[PDB]
Amino acid sequence: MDQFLVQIFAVIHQIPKGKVSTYGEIAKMAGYPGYARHVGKALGNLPEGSKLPWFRVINSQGKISLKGRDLDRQKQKLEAEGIEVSEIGKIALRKYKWQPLE
Known part of the structure; x- marks a missing residue:
């Protein structure tokens, strides 16, 4: 397993149920500056229901990086976490x- 993926994934496991972080924060904690979009590839590369909570990491714009079916894919997972996700894939960072x- 790729060291980069192991590092970012390890960090993501610290995210509790019903919380979302930005790819930049995860990459920073993993020790890979500028690899924000790369973290996004990894999560999108994972199955819809992996052992790793992939749905808990969004972009700095407070929006879902995945689109089409994958948008509602992350959305339905976040709805199981109790997060108010707007139809077009929008999430309130300042609260979530x-x-x-804690």
């Missing part, structure tokens, strides 16, 4: 941001 202070 992953804060490991």
